[PDB]
Q: What sequence folds into this?
């Protein structure tokens, strides 16, 4: 019954479609960049981390040419709870300090600052306009006193996607968005005919 | 004489919800 | 055509082996007889369930007949003979291997209808209602066939 | 007492075997309806 | 001393006496409405207790006249929203508990009138505890056991033919119950709610006897007229003719094994372990 | 924008049923538009190539729908219809986790779920929640809810309604009928010689 | 004399000993997975045997200390992919067999600590034979029985109120099982595959005792605080205070009959035939 | 003292398949 109904309505949907009409084509393609976060406070690694939806939005909007996020502050707080993609701010801020950029490799940004706070449960990166990129937390409170806090962002292709790739230059352009380092943003599209399989190189 | 004295209710919602994945299957096998 | 496989799984490790569109083959043997490849197809659903403590992986797979089901006739066959329409339709409108040795029409009429826009399996079943009530499909290897019944 | 010894600890598991309710499942999910109605041990006869 | 079961102005005392060291009163407690989780990742399950619990009373005792036995049967079988109150003569229980006949059970009450005993009846009650403020319903149906003053044989009448049951080894077991009432869980009362229904009850008479004389004529008259004929909408008229003070009742055999004829090696006669009749509609 | 915080720890699930749903998915749509006099093909090369490479096909594994939307005039609207048709039938994780609390939670909220027997340890979006009293079950559908025979019947019913209305002038002259309803009870009573009747009509 | 049950470094010896002529070892063989055709035109059915068989062991024995009994319970209840090996001291069996607790059972192991019998524990074990190379899983969960050195009464605590169970006639039965593991058929070999699951187990304590003094106070304190209150997702704290060397656990009564108060003709006290508690979520 | 010592799993597919004869019937009674 369902297949006779389905065939009948399909026949009527296409009634009067000109089958010699001009055709046109849209190609659908997917690529993805992982930005992996690692956080070190005084030689203690964070036990959980997020690249939050406001950071994902900042890199998205920068890729549209709407301007890059200027990472300005490391921020530290009192509260391990609620760690999630949807965090717009720390659970409870206690201090913040100006970052220093470092670019140790083609696909890495490190933000470092020297800090003093007892009982730190959470760390984050903040853009000058207050937009949080990262939250990370510890199972046990950390005491910092003239200790370095480092946030390291590393860019990779998502090897889960099939027959599409972010090239090494594409992954470098995403690093250069996170750094505000004059990124080669998308400005052109190319089509070709060599079928040899995709690689980052 | 002392020895002689020694002688399912089934939920229609949960069936119909559970079988949905299977009822629709032949039609998916035939496209739409 | 379809197959269903039920497995045990540990930590979801087997569920990762079956992304949609991955190839699955089922071989059978009885006694000491050699293995026959009885089914070949691709995964369309992977499901994993709590069943009374067991972690049951159920994989469901469809076969090649979906590529006749889910494609439409693009050219116009008016004035082709049925053996020409089979060569036209299978060699452009479906991803199936054509071979003229596998098509043998029992009464090779000329099509008056345009079949343009009809589903391929639906058009082939019309060519088989004309002609001699014929069997068609995707056979051994991946070749199309269209030939007398029984 | 001789008959009662075998009897009592037979009459006990008679209830244990008899009074077990149905518990049908489809595909890991219960399909027995959770009707909140009680049942209790029958008259001893 | 003695246990009282009562409903408004109607009351029955049930002696709670037994031979030797038999069980007089078993009370059971339970949580039929706990959700112990069948699975999950911990060694022991998570649970939730969130409803009224069960309490059951099973009373075993004896009655010293048939009249009181019929009052008890009628009291149990009756549909009424007036609370059925049980008084237990033991300090571990409150002075009154409100009860229903056993919640889903065809046999809430059993009365046995054994052969060789006079002015003794064995009583077994099962009762479910229910909340005293939560007896609910609309209908009202007083049950009545028919009674008469004769002493004729028990008679089974069908197809215009009457069969007298032998006196020899004659024993009577009667069961009564209200399986169509609903006893229901309540969120945070201790005891459940009781829904009294003016609906079909259970009322069964079981006989056992040994046919000693005119054996073919007796057994065949019964089996021909009752078992081998179709009875239609009607059934057997079962008449006690005043034995146990009981009158006449319309009834039918039910199920796969309501009657059995037993022949034993070396015995020149036939045993009937059971002849079982369920009472049918005649309360018109 | 919301996270539920409480989560589903490995001790807090007690049933799960987690598929990837892919039986509906297709990889090409062709949309006729402009009174049926122009066409656009929306083309998913990845699934076409992966079915080819998987099955050993001679050529890319096309699976098609044909649509007509005759009142659509801009080709980018016909494309976006073809892309929506692919996207809403595309292969996704779905299915249910059974737990106990979460009266604060809603569809669209985010939750941490861990199920060690099944290798899950992620933040998911809640697609739906069922609460059952009696059994005390809160059943979370995660990632995306999808139907059964009701998705077939809904796609047919939507298609038939779209075609039913196809010629209707939407600026047509318009008229109104008000449906209204009242009733008179007439109560009979009969008295004969000072005796009331026991039933009447 | 002893059977040995072991898992890596952990090992328990169970004396296969019993009174007189009782059954010490029963081994059952079967073919659950033969297909015998229910119909067909033959006088006798066609069949197909094409899967692993079933082998089961019931072991009955005794243990001479409580410490070993707790080790046995923890050994049986623990989830690990490390094979549980049984050594049977009889020539009809190989030197070692790999085993699972009884394949779908709530009571794979039972330990009885009866009244009178100091430093004797009755052991009944049920084990399913499994393929030694086919123990499969991911999670390890070491089970523990909490222990302490006191001599106090068994205590049941709920709603901030504690009841002490009478010493008089006090017997404990503990049962243990792994019903959430899967023992599964395989096509080519004698013994099935064993899927070890880091999931909910069965662990039950049953008490039996006779309540001799302060009888209303004792029984009402238990029934009010445990059976008539709603316990939420918490439950009873059940504390052995060092009897049998046992400590304290969280537990709950489950189902229609976990507690009974029994009154017998001519007796001035109450029997408690059973009081059942299932252990609940506790570990961290 | 010696006398005292002497004291269903249901396949969703097969339900969905076996009921097919009957689920389609009301619509057949009404033509299509
Ligand atoms: Mg990291
Ligand atoms: Mg009137």
A:
């Amino acid at each position: 019954i369902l297949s006779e109904l389905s065939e009948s309505v399909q026949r009527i949907e296409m009634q009067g479609a000109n089958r010699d009409a001009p055709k046109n084509r849209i190609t659908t393609t997917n690529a993805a960049a992982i930005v992996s976060v690692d956080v070190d406070a005084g030689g203690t690694s964070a036990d959980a981390d997020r690249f939050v939806n406001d950071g994902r939005n900042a890199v998205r909007d920068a890729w549209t040419g709407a301007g890059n996020p200027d990472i300005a502050n490391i921020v530290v707080g009192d509260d391990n709870s609620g760690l999630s993609r949807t965090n717009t701010t720390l659970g409870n801020q206690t201090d913040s300090v100006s970052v220093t950029e470092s670019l140790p490799s083609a696909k890495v940004v490190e933000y470092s600052a020297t800090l003093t706070q007892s009982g730190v449960e959470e760390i984050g990166l903040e853009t000058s306009t207050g937009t949080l990129l990262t939250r990370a937390t510890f199972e046990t409170p950390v005491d910092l006193s003239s200790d370095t806090v480092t946030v390291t962002l590393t860019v990779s292709n998502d090897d889960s996607v099939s027959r599409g790739v972010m090239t090494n230059d594409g992954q470098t352009a995403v690093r250069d968005v996170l750094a505000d380092n004059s990124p080669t943003l998308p400005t052109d599209y190319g089509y070709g005919d060599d079928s040899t399989a995709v690689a980052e190189t | 004489d002392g020895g002689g004295g020694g002688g399912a209710t089934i939920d229609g919602r949960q069936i119909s919800e559970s079988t949905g994945r299977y009822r629709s299957d032949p039609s998916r096998r035939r496209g739409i | 055509d379809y197959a269903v496989f039920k497995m045990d799984d540990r930590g979801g490790q087997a569920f990762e082996a079956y992304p949609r569109g991955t190839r699955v083959e089922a071989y059978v043997s009885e006694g000491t007889e050699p293995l026959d490849n009885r089914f070949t197809g691709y995964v369309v659903e992977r499901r994993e369930n709590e069943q009374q403590g067991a972690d049951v992986l159920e994989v469901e797979a469809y076969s090649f007949d979906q590529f006749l089901r889910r494609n439409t006739v693009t050219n116009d066959q008016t004035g082709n003979t049925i053996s020409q329409a089979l060569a036209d339709i299978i060699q452009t409108d479906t991803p199936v291997r054509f071979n003229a040795a596998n098509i043998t029409v029992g009464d090779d009429q000329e099509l008056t209808r345009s079949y343009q826009g009809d589903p391929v399996e639906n058009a082939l079943r019309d060519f088989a209602f004309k002609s001699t009530n014929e069997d068609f499909g995707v056979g051994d290897d991946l070749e199309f066939f269209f030939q007398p019944r029984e | 007492d001789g008959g009662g010894g075998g009897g009592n600890s037979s009459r006990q598991p008679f209830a244990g075997g008899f009074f077990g309710g149905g518990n049908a499942t489809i595909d890991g999910r219960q399909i027995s309806e959770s009707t909140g109605r009680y049942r209790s041990d029958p008259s001893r006869r | 001393v003695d246990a009282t079961l009562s409903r408004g102005g109607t009351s029955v005392d049930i002696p709670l006496v037994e031979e030797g060291g038999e069980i007089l009163l078993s009370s059971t407690f339970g949580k039929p409405e706990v959700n112990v989780r069948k699975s999950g990742g911990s060694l022991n399950p998570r649970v939730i207790d969130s409803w009224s619990g069960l309490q059951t009373f099973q009373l075993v005792g004896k009655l010293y006249d048939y009249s009181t036995s019929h009052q008890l049967a009628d009291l149990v079988k009756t549909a009424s929203t007036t609370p059925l109150e049980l008084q237990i003569p033991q300090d571990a229980y409150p002075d009154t508990v409100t009860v229903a006949p056993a919640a889903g059970q065809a046999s809430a009450l059993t009365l046995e009138y054994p052969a060789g005993r006079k002015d003794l009846v064995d009583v077994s009650l099962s009762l479910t505890r229910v909340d005293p403020n939560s007896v609910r319903g609309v209908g009202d149906q007083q049950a009545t056991t028919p009674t008469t003053t004769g002493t004729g044989p028990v008679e089974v009448t069908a197809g215009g033919t009457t069969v007298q049951l032998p006196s020899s080894g004659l024993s009577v077991e009667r069961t009564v119950g209200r399986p169509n009432d609903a006893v229901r869980r309540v969120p945070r009362q201790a005891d459940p709610r009781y829904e009294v229904k003016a609906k079909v009850t259970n009322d069964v008479f079981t006989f056992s006897f040994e046919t000693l004389d005119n054996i073919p004529a007796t057994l065949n008259a019964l089996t021909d007229n009752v078992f081998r004929e179709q009875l239609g909408r009607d059934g057997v008229t079962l008449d006690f003719n005043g034995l146990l003070g009981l009158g006449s009742v319309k009834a039918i055999p039910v199920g796969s094994s309501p009657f059995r004829q037993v022949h034993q090696a070396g015995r020149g006669w036939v045993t009937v372990p059971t002849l079982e009749f369920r009472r049918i509609y005649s309360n018109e | 924008t919301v996270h539920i915080d409480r989560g589903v720890d490995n001790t807090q699930w007690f049933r799960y049923d987690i598929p990837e749903l892919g039986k509906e998915a297709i990889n090409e749509v062709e949309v006729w538009f402009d009174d049926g006099e122009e066409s656009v093909i929306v083309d998913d090369g990845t699934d076409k190539l992966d079915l080819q490479d998987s099955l050993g096909l001679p050529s890319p594994g096309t699976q098609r729908k044909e649509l007509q939307r005759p009142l659509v005039t801009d080709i980018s609207d016909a494309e976006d219809i073809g892309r929506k048709y692919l996207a809403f039938r595309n292969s996704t994780l779905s299915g249910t986790v059974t737990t106990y609390g979460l009266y604060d939670a809603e569809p669209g909220d985010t939750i941490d779920i861990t199920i060690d027997p099944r290798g899950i340890d992620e933040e998911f979006v809640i697609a739906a929640i069922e609460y059952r009293w009696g059994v005390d079950e809160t059943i979370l559908t995660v990632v995306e809810k999808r139907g059964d025979v009701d998705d077939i019947l809904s796609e047919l019913s939507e298609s038939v309604q779209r075609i039913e209305m196809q010629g209707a002038n939407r600026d047509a002259p318009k008229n109104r009928i008000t449906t209204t309803n009242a009733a008179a009870i007439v109560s009979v009573d009969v008295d004969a010689g000072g005796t009331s009747a026991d039933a009447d009509r």
Q: What stands out?
A: Residues 149-164 of chain F form the longest helix (16 residues). Residues A 36-38, 49 surround magnesium ion (ligand 1) (CB under 6 Å). Chains F and H do not touch (no CB pair under 8 Å).
